[PDB]
Amino acid sequence: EGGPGTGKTVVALHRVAYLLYTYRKQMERHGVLVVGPTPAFLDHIGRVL
Amino acid sequence: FPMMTEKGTFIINGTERVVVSQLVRSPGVYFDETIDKSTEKTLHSVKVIPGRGAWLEFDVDKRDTVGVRIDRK
């Protein structure tokens, strides 16, 4: 949780990448569920993921 | 009680016979890993296999829950 303009989204995606590399044995077959408020936000995630 | 000769054989009705050693799976707890064809997920299971008695199996299924099968029920 952080005030606006702190880039929380990219930090969270970096955290996700770190988790999915470190524990790839336990998660790679299960995948990731990315939940977003609008389709445009999910397109943004698809761009920066 | 039939007795073994010095040659390692049994004389049964005058005929010389031999008893061969049988290779068998030992009783114990055996863990196994397989792939769920429906999801390609990795599932684990374990069987406790006794010399005599009911079987006891545990497993982690594709929905990430731990379950038990008792007496193959």
Curated annotation (Swiss-Prot), chain B:
Residue ranges crossing the lipid bilayer per the database entry: none
Superkingdom, taxonomy of origin: Bacteria
Additional record remark: Mutations in the RRDR sequence (residues 423-449) confer rifampicin (Rif) resistance. Rif blocks transcription initiation but not elongation.
UniProt record similarity statement: Belongs to the RNA polymerase beta chain family.
Subunit structure, interactors included: The RNAP catalytic core consists of 2 alpha, 1 beta, 1 beta' and 1 omega subunit. When a sigma factor is associated with the core the holoenzyme is formed, which can initiate transcription. Interacts with RbpA, which partially restores Rif-inhibited transcription.
Task of the protein: DNA-dependent RNA polymerase catalyzes the transcription of DNA into RNA using the four ribonucleoside triphosphates as substrates. This subunit often mutates to generate rifampicin (Rif) resistance. Interaction with RbpA partially restores Rif-inhibited transcription; once the subunit is Rif-resistant however RbpA no longer stimulates transcription.
Official protein name in the record: DNA-directed RNA polymerase subunit beta
The encoding gene: rpoB
Part of the full-length chain shown: 148 to 220 of 1169
